[PDB]
Structure formats: C-alpha cells, structure tokens
Amino acid sequence: DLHDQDAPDEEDFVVCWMQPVMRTAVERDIDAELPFCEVTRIDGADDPEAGTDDPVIQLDFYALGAEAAKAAAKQGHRRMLFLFRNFPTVTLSDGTLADLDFGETLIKPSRMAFEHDQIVRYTARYQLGTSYVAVP
Amino acid sequence: DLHDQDAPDEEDFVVCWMQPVMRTAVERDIDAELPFCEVTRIDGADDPEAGTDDPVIQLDFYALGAEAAKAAAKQGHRRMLFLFRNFPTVTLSDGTLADLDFGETLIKPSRMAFEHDQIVRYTARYQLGTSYVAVP
Amino acid sequence: DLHDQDAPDEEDFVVCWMQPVMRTAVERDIDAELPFCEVTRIDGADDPEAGTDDPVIQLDFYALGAEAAKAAAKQGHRRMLFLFRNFPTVTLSDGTLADLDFGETLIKPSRMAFEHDQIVRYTARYQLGTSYVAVP
Amino acid sequence: DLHDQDAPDEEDFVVCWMQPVMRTAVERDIDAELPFCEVTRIDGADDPEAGTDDPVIQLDFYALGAEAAKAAAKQGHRRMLFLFRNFPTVTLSDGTLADLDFGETLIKPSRMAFEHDQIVRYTARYQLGTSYVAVP
Amino acid sequence: DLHDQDAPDEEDFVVCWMQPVMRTAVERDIDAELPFCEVTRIDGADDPEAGTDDPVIQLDFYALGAEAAKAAAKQGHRRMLFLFRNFPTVTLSDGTLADLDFGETLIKPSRMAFEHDQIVRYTARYQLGTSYVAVP
Amino acid sequence: DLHDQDAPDEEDFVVCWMQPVMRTAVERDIDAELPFCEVTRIDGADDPEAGTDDPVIQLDFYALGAEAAKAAAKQGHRRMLFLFRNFPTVTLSDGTLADLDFGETLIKPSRMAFEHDQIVRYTARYQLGTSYVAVP
Amino acid sequence: PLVELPGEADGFSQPVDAEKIGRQFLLYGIRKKEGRYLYEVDAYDLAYLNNKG
Amino acid sequence: EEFGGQVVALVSVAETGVPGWGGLKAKARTTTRQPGVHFRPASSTETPDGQTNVATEVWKLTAPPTAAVLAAKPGGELVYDGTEHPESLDLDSAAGRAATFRVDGPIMPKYDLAGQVHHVTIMCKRQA
Amino acid sequence: EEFGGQVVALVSVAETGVPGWGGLKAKARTTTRQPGVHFRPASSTETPDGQTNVATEVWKLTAPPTAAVLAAKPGGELVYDGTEHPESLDLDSAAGRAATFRVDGPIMPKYDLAGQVHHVTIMCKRQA
Amino acid sequence: VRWSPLAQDGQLRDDLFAHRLENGVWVENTNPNEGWYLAGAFGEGNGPSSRPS
Amino acid sequence: VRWSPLAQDGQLRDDLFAHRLENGVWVENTNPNEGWYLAGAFGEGNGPSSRPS
C-alpha cells in the first residue's frame, strides 16, 4: 500500500499558473501559436521525515523573431517574480489547492540554439520550495 | 572457499517489493504492457569488517503518453516512500527474508529522452542501506 | 498580473551604448560592413527582495583581416572601460534612462575560430551590475 | 643494472587466486566457456623508500544470461572478500609466495554494456595493498 | 568617447621581442621557412582602477624534424627567460616603448600533434604582467 | 641575446639512461624490434629565480604478446627505480654530464589500447626534479 | 495533564522568573534484521534543562 | 488514375477542448478512405537488445493527387491492414494501434511539364 | 511457389509462467518448418582483438508468403544447419546454439500491382 | 522485574503515549495510559547524542 | 484578552503601521494607527535569529 502524503505536481502547478498570461504545456505539438512556454524538471530531492522538497524547473520560450521572444521572456520572468513575491494560491487541474514555500532565480532568460531558423528560443531556470500535503 | 556472509541481492529486493503494485523486471522484452519499472545498480561499496553496504538503485518508468508515465512515476515514488518509512519485510525469489537499514531519495522522477516516440520514460534515483546476513 | 519592477534590458543597453562608436546588433545578417559587434547574455541571477541583478555579457568583434579585427577589439574594450569608469547615462530604444552599479572585465579580447577565412573574430566577456527600476 | 626489489605481479596474483573457483585470464579468446573473469590494472603508485604500493584492480564477469552473470559476480565478490579477510598465501605461476597488506572494495558489481546480445557483463573494482619482496 | 589609457598590445610585444632571434608572426602562411614561432592569447583580465593586467600568451614552434623543433623550442625558451630576468625595453611596430612587470612559465615546451608529417610542433605557455600607459 | 643557464634535456637524459638496457627513442619507425620504450613530456614548469624545474615524463613499452610486454614494463620500472635510488651520472649525446634532484612514480605500468592487434602497449608515468646548469 | 491539543491553545509565554523542573527521558533505537526486531532503549530518571541552541 | 491495388485510410489530427492535465488538449481524429494506392516497405532497423529492444520500419506510399491526399499534414496517421475497408476500424482497439502508422516528413508532390501534380509520395514509420 | 532449395525452421517466442529471479519469466518456444527458401550471407564484420574478440554475421532470407512466415515477430529465432529436417533439433544442445539465428528488424513483405503479398525478406544475425 | 518498556510478549507497549494522531486529527487517547509525549522529526545529521566529559 | 496582533476575524490587523508606500511614494498614514515602523529587505542567509546563552 502506498504512502499517504506527496507534494503537489510541480509541472501541473507551473502550467496552471502561467496559463492565464500565455499558452503553456509540457509538450509543444508540431504546429501552434508562437507565444509558448514549455515546462520541465531537471533535478530534485524529497525527504519524508522533514517534509521537504526542492524541485528545479525550466521554462523555454518560443516566439517568432528575436523581439517577440525577448518580450515573451520578460513577461514570463515578471509573472514568475510576482508568484515568488505574493505567494498566491493556484488551483490545479485536479481542483486541489497548492502553495509554495519560497522561490529563487538561478538563470535569467538567455538565448539558446534551435533548429527552426525563424523561431527564437529563450531559456530560464528556477528553483522552488514545496511541502507535503495529504493525499485525497 | 568463499566467504560466509553477503548482503541480500538489491535488484531482486527491489523487484520483489515493487512487483505487487506494478510490473517490474531487470530487463524489458521487445513487447510488454506499458506500466513498467526497470531496476539497475550504478554504484556501491562493501565493507566486510563493519558489515556496511551502500548501494545505489535506479528506477525507470515506461508508459504510453506523458500523463500515464507521470502517474506511474508518482505511484512508484509513493511506494518507495512507504518502503523507506515503515521498514517492511520483503520475501525474495529464493524465499529469504531481507530488510533495510535506511533510505534516501537522490533524484525525484524527471523526464528523459527515449527512442520510441509514444512511450515516455521517467527516471528516479534512490540510495539504500543494507547489512550482512549469513549465507544459507 | 505581472510584477511592477524589472531591470533594464541588458542587450538593448549595450547595443545603444556601443552603437555611437561602431555598428552593433544582437544578430548579424548575411551581409554587412566589417566593423561589427555582437551582444549576447550567457548567465545571470535576479533577486527581487534585495533588488540585485548580475548579468554576464559577451561581445564578438568581426572585421576583415587580423589587423582590423584587433583594432576594433581594442576600440571596443576602451569604450567599455570608459563606460565602467565614468558611469554615463544611456538612453534605450524605448527612451527610458538606465544606469549601472559597477563593472568588471572577465576575459580580455582573444582570438576564436570562425568559418569565414577572411573575417577574423575576437571575443571578450564582461560582467555587469544592475538594479530594479519601476515598470512604466 | 636493475634494482633488487619489486612488488609481486598483481595480475598474476589475482589470476592465480581466482582460478580455483572459476576460469580467469588477462585476455579472453574469441571462444571460451561462459564463466569467465578478466583482470586489469587502471592505476597505482610505487614508493621505493617506504616500500609502499597501491594498485587498483578491475574484474569483469561474462556469462550467458542475466541470472548466470549475477551469480558469477556474487561468487567472485565472495571469493574476494574471503581473500581480504583471511589473508591467505597465494602461489604464483613462477612458484613464488606472495601476500597482501590490506584490501578494500570500491565498486560493488554492476551492469555494463557489451556488444554481444546474449552475454551479460558485470564489472567490479577493488583496491589492494602490497609491499616489496626481494628479487630472486 | 574612448578611455585614455590601455595596456600595450601583448602579441605585438612578443612578436617584436622574438623577431631578432627567429621568424615570428601571429599567423603562418601556407609556405615559409621552418624556424617559426606563433603567438596567441588565451586568457586575461583588466582592472582599470588598479592598473593591473594579467595576459596569458602561447608560443608554437614549427620546424622540420624532431631535432630542429626541439632546438628551436630551447632557443625560444632561453630568449623568454632572458626577457623575464633582465626586463629590457622593447620597441613596438608603432614605435612606442613598452615594458613588463613580471613573468612566469606555466608549461615548458612539449610535443603536440600536427597534420603535416614532417613538421614537428612544440608548444609552450607563459604568463605576463603589464600596466597601463597613456594613449598617445 | 639568450640566457646563460638551462636545465638538461629531459628526453635525451631518459633515452641515454634507458638505452643500455633496451632500445629506446623519442619516435618509433614503422618497423623495428619489439623491445621498445618511447619517451615524451606532458607538463612542467621552470623558475629562473630559484633554479627549479619539475618535468613530467611518460614511458610507453611495446612488445609482442602480453607476456613480453609485461616483462619489458617490469624491467623498465626496475631500471627507473634504480635511477631514482642511486642517483647515477648520465652522459648525454652532447657529452655533458647531468644529474637529478629526486624522482617519484605517478602511474605504475598499466595496459592501454593500440591499433596493432599483436603488439601490446604498456604505459607508465614518472615525475622528475632537475636544476639549472651553465650553458657551455 | 495540562498539555493542550495542537491548534487549541494560543500563544505561550516565558515567565520572568522560572524554577527547575524535573523531567524523564527515553531514547529509542530500533533496528531490525532478518525479520526480527532488536531494541535499545535508554532510561533517565531525572533531567534538567541545561542549554538552548 | 490508379497506381496500385491497395487501400489506405488517411487520418487527420485536430486537437480540441479545454486544456487538461499538463496543458495537453484532447485529440479529435477524422478518417478518409483513399483507394488504389501502392504501399511498400522502404527500410527497417533495430536497436541492440541490451536492456530495451526497439525496432523501426519505414514505408513508402504513392497516391493519386486527390483532394484528401494533398491536404495531409505532418503529424497525421494512416491505417492499413490489407483489407478493403480499413477506415471502419477502432483506433482505440489493440488492432487499431498495431495497424496505425505515423507520417514522417512533409508531403512530397511530383509535378509534370504542364505544371500539374501527377502523384504524391509519403513517408511512414511504425515502431514496436 | 518455390524460391530456393533450402529449408529453415522458424522458432516463435512466447514467455510464460510465474516471474522468477529478477522478474524474468521462462521462455516457451514453438518451431515451424518452412521449406523452399533462399538463405545467403549479407555482410559480416569483426571487432578488434584487443582484449575481447567479437564477430558478427548478417544473412538474408526470402520465403513464400505462407501463413507461418507472415506471423513472425521481432525477437524470434530460426534454425538452419543445411539439413532437410532442422526442426527436430535441440535448442539446448550446443549444436542448436551454434545453428540458431536471431531475427533482426521487422518483417519486410513485398507487394504486387494486385495488392497481394509476393515474397517476404527477413534479416538475420549471429555472433560468436 | 518492576517496570520495563518492553511487553511480556517481547513487543513494545502501546499504552505508553498520551496523544495519538488518527486520520490527520490530533485526538487525546481514551484508553488508560501512563502519559508520555513523543517528539517529531529530527534534522539530518542531528539526533539523540550524548557527550560525556 | 487585552491585546493581540491578530484581528478578531483571524486575519492580521491593518492599522498597525504608521507609514505606507503607495504608487512609489512614501506618504504618512491618515487613518488612526498605533504607530509601528517596518524594516525592509534582509540579506540572504541572515534573518531574525536568537542566540540564548
């Protein structure tokens, strides 16, 4: 039988938080609108005894042209800063309510290579702090 | 003549523990059902004098689609947390009884590349602590 | 809703500062005049609580022949040193006024490989210090 | 004229020690029986003044199927542990008698890739301690 | 407007110093005489406030055969040692007078691979110390 | 004008020392006898003020078959140990007399890959200590 | 007993003048091998508060 | 005209609906029957069976320049099982999954001297 | 029809039973005789004999489109030793191991203008 | 034997504690008990330790 | 209950502070207030800490 506590899903959290300002999903189909954020997890650690979780989240921004890509990256960074500062409540797809413990910016948006020669990709990296909520 | 003590087989331990909740084996055949965990060892160290063993175990989750893969990874992580917390007794294939000393999560499940374009692979890493039992 | 403060755009800052002395843009078209500087960001970190930002900026110099490339690199380094020392005010494309907190040279201009066999590329790296201004 | 002292040959030592329990050689021909151990040295250091030698030895196990490979690896590890604990005397090919000072396990047997799709290769790493004996 | 101080050109300094003893240039044409030194910069740092500059310089020696290459490398190293010890004044191409603050040898000449099968390439690395002189 | 002091040539030193016991040269022609040692330098540092030089020397042994290669490596290591211990005087090709300050073994002979499938290559690494003698 | 259930009492307080209070302590170490429990428990009849952190 | 004696069912993909978990939307599919085409394997490889074994196949399809074929886009599917009416098949079914291919690369039309499309070549792949 | 004067024995693989050590299940095999086929080597290489020497062979098989051949799946085996009845052989035997091949890649059928399968090409490999 | 934390059967006692946690709710124990309070988690690298002098 | 930083509803009080920041302008509070001043940011790794001896 499984354990009774687990942290909220980090990717779902970030998607449901960024969605009101710009289109976002874990994966991008072959065709979509330019404004677009992609979420991923690279590293983390969970401690059942202390209820401590330290996930690392990556955001990729795709847009047509350098100007639009930079503007989208700036908007996304501002949204993340708002989330870090005001500690708002986010409703997931499942309807559960989840919150954060803290936040920190590791890499401010920079330019990365991409196969498509018109779409410009910007990449930012963030660190989060989360606790354990009871499994419903 | 060989020594008379050895730690229990780590891969067999993990397989016999995860099997009740989901299909698991050391190797995946060319065709099988989606829910699937794969076990591996990457590193360790054995000390005969102190009876100390520190193996490192990797779990790979394969499932069709991102959603199913993430759900399977969450279920596997919860099962591992239950094992770490309650210290249950596990019966191996050989019928021997084996236990743990502690446990710790190094990498919480994240996404990795895979050749198949429909199956999504998630990877988690764990550390274990084991002692020496008498060889029967 | 987004946050109300953000640092000035580093690439736009550097472009608008270097432009009076030599042609500069974030990207070089297939054909242009030789004197040319290219700006990029590689790393940084933002702290909303303390109002601290530490971006890293790269300048690439392209010119025909080794002599012209070295002369352009020397001129660019002197311009950057002037900026670091006198702390002048720079007007961006948007018309906003932005300033610096400090500056430091990490890599003095050196020679790097390039596909074209006539254009010689020189590369220098710099570190900046910036604060948060109110979003208009 | 050469020096008059040297440590015993480490590869010959390990081969003559593991041979009674399983086929072992420094190199494997194109065809042989499955049970098989391969010996190698990766690093070491010799100090003539203090009579100190710290070689590093690698054992590779080849067998048909995962089960047989794991069983062979377990048997080899038990034999090595017996050698580390009881400090027995080993007769080399040359007939000389050689002994150890200590022993330590760096990497407990794990799985590695191999070209053949039926033979499974397991790899373990060990550290030894040896002194200088008079050259006969 | 540019700054009014800058360090002397390191490559021009080294070329004008090594030229009396052996042919040297920043780049080697497709055909030239064997005795040949090539100068390059790999790293450095400039501090306007303290007037401190720490460039790193590389010398490559090309000659026909191992013997001639080694002899040329020895001669170049001796010339560099003379420069480090006696602190002589060097006249650049521009006619300016420049000096050093100190010097240190990082890598004594060693052998490196080269495409041509008759020319043998030797490589040495040096560190320099320079100050700021007024721009004329 | 060049400096008046320089350390003795390390490669020539090692070649003239190992030559009495086995064929040795800086480079091996396409065909030669099996017993063979090859000398090389990988790293070093020279200090004119203190008269200190710390070169690093590599010896490669080629022989037909594993047995002959191992025997040659053992003989070479014993010769090097004799040199380290007794501090003998070595006459170079130029006729000059040169000596050592100390010696230390970094990597005891181990097995490395080689293109030829009959010749087995063994590699050992050593560190030396040398001073400055007057240039004649 | 005077200890309250969690989330029931309001903010506590540290009195200006306090007095030594005697307390009991048991330290538990539980280790299991081959499906069998081994217990190591320490007993302390009396213990006072020495230092904080 | 006719280029062969095989019938395939091109399947279109058009995502619709409110975003679900992880921002992914449900997929709505539409099938169209295109008969008289030629379908032949092109190449096939396999990954070494060390711990996980993966096999891939590549097929070629040549079809008349009909309206449906010319409107195909990358990321679509086509279903073939050697039957006269493969369109009346359940994609959710195990047989449907075993008989569904994935479009690889863009549509490749062929033109004549009159500036008209003559036939269309399409790359397909399927793995296990 | 007939495509050659060689006879091969296709072997199917179907794992069954309670999981054993490490979660692996025992393998149950079924053999089927398919005569009148052509079997020829395709390519062969070797790994340098530094410490371990490995050699690989690749063969091609062309068979009539029978029911048994069309049902083969990747990961199966076929046995050939230049005899008329290779199916009556022990896989456990050393000769059986020396004469068993491994199927490489998916089944490759060839179609005609009538939309019917004409012959099947299969890749095989064997190592030492 | 006067008192012992171990039961006669060899298991641990259950009446030792005063508070229990059930279904995420802190409820007082209704069964008879001696009355003991249990500390929670411990930071990594820190635990019950004794330093005699 | 005499005084408490928590309001009756369970939220925090608002009349606690004396100065407020609005639209980037430091303006004195016109509403009634007890009068309290708030410190700003804190360097990373440093915060309100107590070290009893």
Topology summary:
This is part of a larger assembly, with six copies of chain A (136 residues), three copies of chain G (53 residues) and two copies of chain H (128 residues).
Chain A: E1 5-6, H1 10-18, E2 24-25, E3 36-43, E4 46-47, E5 52-53, E6 56-64, H2 65-86, E7 90-91, E8 97-98, E9 102-112, E10 119-129, E11 133-134
Parallel strand pairs in A: 2-3
Antiparallel strand pairs in A: 1-11, 3-6, 4-5, 6-10, 7-8, 9-10
Chain G: E1 23-33, E2 36-47
Antiparallel strand pairs in G: 1-2
Chain H: E1 6-16, E2 26-46, E3 55-63, H1 67-70, E4 77-79, H2 94-98, E5 100-111, E6 117-127
Antiparallel strand pairs in H: 1-2, 1-4, 2-3, 3-6, 4-5, 5-6
Biggest β-sheet description of chain G? 2 strands, antiparallel
Order of helices and strands of chain G: EE
Percentage of residues in DSSP E strands of chain H: over 45%
Give the CA-based shape of chain G: elongated
Question: What is the succession of H and E elements of chain H?
Answer: EEEHEHEE
Proportion of residues in helical segments of chain G = under 10%
Strand order of the largest sheet of chain G: 1-2
Structural class by SSE content of chain H: mainly beta
How many beta-strand segments of chain H? 6
Helix fraction of chain H by DSSP (H/I, runs of at least 4): under 10%
Protein name (chains H, I): Head-to-tail stopper
Region (Disordered) (chains H, I): 28-49
Protein name (chain G): Major tail protein
